[PDB]
Symmetry: D2
């Protein structure tokens, strides 16, 4: 469809969703979803990130939840083609005042010891709050991603400085609804998602998603519409709260979130996002940035099934994700943390390569690429005769991901 309007006119409620669900699903784990058996089913149904709410519970309790999450996750490790990484997120209590309380310091230190992937930092009002959280995590927690939660007016007013200091953003709509009038929160949500998309940083929408599923096996029309519109605004991930933490239908909530998010993909008009993001980006001569733009460009032309990115830290894959290709970004990494953290970005499908490093660099690249091809075929992103883009460095120890290759799927 050559216009957004025609894209809307062609939507059909009777035809099933042909496209993959490209947004992350974050689920809050509590008494209802804590057991290894429930977590297994939640992972199969689409959970990408387990969130632990440190407003409640002891460290002993959370250590057991984390252990259960990992037991459930690694139960699928025996098939590396189908294995999905699952991230762990620590959501701080925060001030209920200083940015980091005595309790938050202890909780953050515990997160470092437990090897969590990301921190959702509560009640962030300004940049210096983010830097205080960074300082507590320290040298040992330096690769842990900090997602600043915008929960009040000051957070919204000072958004630009908070965004620049953070690794990502969580929009807490319910908390914003208390301090900001109802007729304005939807504008704040749209503003913040937009600015995050422009900056290439993850944005999560949270609170008041599928709350009615705490008691019911299906959500309301309004809730489906609200979740869908967060996806269409440009959210990278959607987070579920009590629905998965303590409700009666945690597994049904994950499945419904998956269905809604997958339906919303049919309303996304991908070409416009990219053309605007390409024009708004500053003119640069950084090799990686030029290669990322070129890859997304090629992914729209030679109607590509995927952009395969070989990445150690995830950074190269994130640079591609900023431009919002339609094609999935298969991020191949040997770093387990990188694979878990990648779920924060819309359209990144991380895969953890567990094979050992080959001495000949070109053979090692070919092995990781072949692994990505098998994963893509199995997930139905592409098949034999399709073409994909492959991004790598040139030589072992390259700082740039500056090599782009157009490759037919064998």
């Amino acid at each position: 469809a050559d216009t957004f309007l025609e894209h809307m006119c062609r939507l059909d409620i009777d035809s099933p969703p042909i496209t993959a669900r490209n947004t992350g699903i974050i689920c809050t784990i509590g008494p209802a979803s804590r057991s290894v058996e429930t977590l297994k089913e939640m992972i199969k149904s689409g959970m990408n990130v387990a969130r632990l709410n440190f407003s409640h519970g002891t460290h002993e309790y959370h250590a057991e939840t984390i252990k259960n999450v990992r037991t459930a996750t690694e139960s699928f490790a025996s098939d590396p083609i189908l294995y999905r990484p699952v991230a762990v997120a620590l959501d701080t209590k925060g001030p209920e005042l200083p940015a980091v309380s005595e309790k938050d310091i202890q909780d953050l230190k515990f997160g470092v010891e437990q090897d969590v992937d990301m921190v959702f930092a509560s009640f962030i009002r300004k940049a210096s709050d983010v830097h205080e959280v960074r300082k507590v995590l320290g040298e040992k927690g330096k690769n842990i991603k900090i997602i600043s939660k915008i929960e009040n007016h000051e957070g919204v007013r000072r958004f630009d400085e908070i965004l620049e200091a953070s690794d990502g953003i969580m929009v807490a709509r319910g908390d914003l609804g208390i301090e900001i009038p109802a007729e304005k929160v939807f504008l704040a949500q749209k503003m913040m998602i937009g600015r995050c998309n422009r900056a290439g940083k993850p944005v999560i929408c949270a609170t008041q998603m599928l709350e009615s599923m705490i008691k019911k096996p299906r959500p309301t029309r309004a809730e489906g519409s609200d979740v869908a519109n967060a996806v269409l605004d440009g959210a990278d991930c959607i987070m579920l709260s009590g629905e998965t933490a303590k409700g009666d239908y945690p597994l049904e909530a994950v499945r419904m979130q998956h269905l809604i998010a997958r339906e919303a993909e049919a309303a996304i008009y991908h070409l416009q996002l990219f053309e605007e993001l390409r024009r708004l980006a500053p003119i640069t001569s950084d090799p990686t940035e030029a290669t990322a733009v070129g890859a997304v460009e090629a992914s729209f032309k030679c109607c590509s099934g995927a952009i395969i990115v070989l990445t150690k830290s995830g950074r190269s894959a994130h640079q591609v994700a900023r431009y919002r290709p339609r094609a999935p970004i298969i991020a191949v990494t040997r770093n387990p943390q990188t694979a878990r953290q990648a779920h924060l970005y819309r359209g990144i499908f991380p895969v953890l390569c567990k094979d050992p490093v080959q001495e000949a660099w070109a053979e090692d690249v070919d092995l990781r690429v072949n692994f990505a091809m098998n994963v893509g075929k199995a997930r139905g992103f592409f098949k034999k005769g399709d073409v994909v883009i492959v991004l790598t460095g040139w030589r072992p120890g390259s700082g740039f991901t500056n090599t782009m290759r157009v490759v037919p799927v064998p």
Copy 2:
């Protein structure tokens, strides 16, 4: 802003809304909003259309409501610069199923609990003895159209039942979703072949009454196909031929047959709550976006209805969710938003109108007008009709010479509607001497109708200048523009002209 993304990035919740609210507000009038004094305040606060729900009330009652609406409306007629036309809409009963009266004395509500049994009866002895065990309803054929396993929804989806056993004139059900059952509530039978007619005997009488009362539009309930629309058209007849028919899409068949319904109707109402019963929750937002899109493409008005500001029945302010849902209907492309119980029977009818106005006005800052137009221009079929070429040219000019308004001199409204299809940012000031045309124009996004009551000058060019000067005064007073801005003026050429084919670029003096 040259990109949609930058348009979103520049949104600021602290800066007040610089732009006008361009969508229509339709309010349902009932016991809470019926009086001349309340209506006056609702009109000042932004009500453009009064909706009368003929599911309830006698013709005598509705005649008095209509009279009160007109008394309130004409109380502002002494200042023709500030006078706002107010339309009247008749919303038909249609093929409804309803429950009976709650039993006994005391509170007129009973708690139905999940897992509990409930017998549905058609025995008229129980018509006014509804309770936790027995529920009467008025659809006699219900046992022929429903099976074991069928779902039955009561009171706009509040309560749900599953049929466990059929009988001759009864059904034993189990309550799936509990709630308070009141008296005379609406019943939906999803996936059931309900044999009730499109226009009942009662609907015929109601439609004839609407013609006699000179209503501006009809909201036709439960439209399933084009022939239902044509039956409504036939009843309105020659005498009601200028009354606009808005088809309500309330079920799956309505959505499946949307194209034929749209082509037969003057416009569409999307009833989201009713659609939520028959269609899964994960799909209704797609149906809403599809239908609004197709209406925008066809140049026909689309109204979003149900589940707008329902919490304001009891509270002076809406929830964050409701604000977000209303706003998104506006951003999808809705021409109007309709309020139901919030204005009809709730405790804060005036606050509901004001909040709807605030939400809709805030949503305008998120609308990216240039994209809508560029796409609507490309999707329109290549034509040599003078009026269509002039309408496109006017909207084009309204984006270039950053225009404060497109002024359209129109008798029937049609010329102004053709401009509105292209979705200019600038307001369309539709100047007309026809009072009905001025009322009906509120159905279209971005049309600000003004009723010129001055007599016709013999020299045509002087008459045009007089109507344009009237539009200029109205625009200055509403803050659309001021001295030094430029406006587009569309007219015919000569008094007999069939086309609105003349465009004029005019500085505001």
Copy 3:
């Protein structure tokens, strides 16, 4: 054709020119072309402007040439549908030094007395030279158009100030070839034509056009290519010199110029010219300028046969011509001078309405429009059922041409 490249690829030398010749033809009148009988044939064959070279001849001699031009021109006046206005141009001797010599002053005064339409001012080096010519023409000659001839390096270096002071420009390629190297004159030509197009002022290419036709009935391949390329650069008019003044085939020269210019129209890609001219124009709220842009825009959409402009001074038609529509601009005027001067602009087909003024303004407009419709049908610009754009003012005595009308051809 949606691209310039495809426009070139579709050119067909075997199909005849479907489009009108939109550039003006200026012919130098001398001993070979001076007679009433030859002028008649030159006018029928396409001459729009008669140029008189005041380097030679007495005032008596030139008065007779002017009289012969007018006798020939008015011989077609009995049919006002087919009558073509013919302009008279005085080309000064100039310095062969002050801008205006004693001789030039006398020649310019004679031009005012003879009611010439335009002056081609020789050897213009700077703006003050143009203002001296303006001062000599004075109040009585204030509507006479001054075309500055750029004949040397200083003229090119100071082009912007000369252009701003002049009504139009003549590029004298042969004279430029003496003072500027041959490998650079083509750049000067392209630069000057471009700047004139951007400013909305007429530009004429002169010298070394069809010189071989002084002795031969047909031009060379090279000369055809050179004339054609001046048209494709954006020239409004092409001027012939000795070919028509003193050569053996003056009538054949006019006809060949017409054929070359008409062939060149097939290579003009009109949509690009307009889209660029629209973007480069400064953002304004002048009603006439907005209406002119809108008219040209509409002329590309409702595939218009013409833009009809009712104009007293010509200015409204010139403002439309700046945007380079494909459709011919039929400029209807009662002012005989306006009709003659309009030939300086590419794409303007002037028509002189000789009917008396109707008292009712709307009827007078309708009469002039009907006249334009008959002229257009007769010239084959359009026929019954086509649609045209009509531009007018609103009341009698309107300063703006701010009214645009889409009109089917009856």
Copy 4:
């Protein structure tokens, strides 16, 4: 500059050319330019291709010219960073008609005057007795293909005759355009069905000689249709299969059948002067623009030839008109410009090469590169061929990270040609070990070929790095870029790769 118009407005005759000359220069070698010392100077001054005209001379003579060209070319081989490849082109005689020898002793020229009679004879007694009354020519069938009223042109259109009477073996004509008639001049019969074969007995021998001499390309004369091209291809055979065939379009039939000729050929030469005889003057500029356009769209080389700098046969500087005509051929999209008598037999062969270089270099300032590419990208068919996608991506990147060059490692040249089709601003440094590939690359606008003479490294990645480093040194020395600039590098992935499908963004060390 964001518009073509502004690009023209900013042209400045006082500022020197900042950019390289990107079009090829082809020079005809004859008595004036034949010596090793002159060729050396012509190569330094910018000659990329030496053309040998086989209309005249023996094979012995041409073998010596070819040897001199190679001696001159290889004299610069001692510095492989600065060495420029020089191609050799064989231009066939084809089906030509020629006059005989001028009579008697004295001057070898006679004045034919307008209105005078001239008898054309086929009697071989008059073969060497041509004068004002009698002219012999070598086309025996001429009387069968010409009528009364037919025009006959002699010596590249200098003289024109009209046939007044036919005979068995004679034609009586009247001279229309007079001039000096010399010996053995070319004869054109416009609109006549000349039955001469596409490849004559002589052309077969000349083409076989070209294969033996290892020429790089053939300019095939008087190509009228695709089958003529295939006959030339067949004669070159298996041994001459990599020799490029450039079809010369010299008549109306060539233009009418252009598409099939283009599809059969490796490239095209537009012979404007020859076209000017058979096609009217007011149409040849359209044919030139059409043919260049179609060649650009197809990605095949197009050369403009004839009537370039002809006045430099006698003068050290060209005319304004000639400079303008050459410049406009470049701006139309020509890949190369060919010089004829200016370099073959004139008094200033070296000055002609230098002036051609200056004109072509000046014309680069008027080229608007971004438009060419954006249109060529849109007009190209949607494909999934890896090399084509990579070529487009490389040119795209060359406009963004303001690249100094696109470096392409290529064996046959094909990968570099695929990049050249998209018309990047940045030079395409085509690195090859194949000497023929390096010579043939000059046919394409914007390809700067470099011949790597270093031996192949066993490790593929090291070999790539070596060739890339060689290209970097060549680019630094030519001033295309310096340390800190960024370039695009295209290669295969692995030594067995069929595709050039790997693109690398590389800072210049």
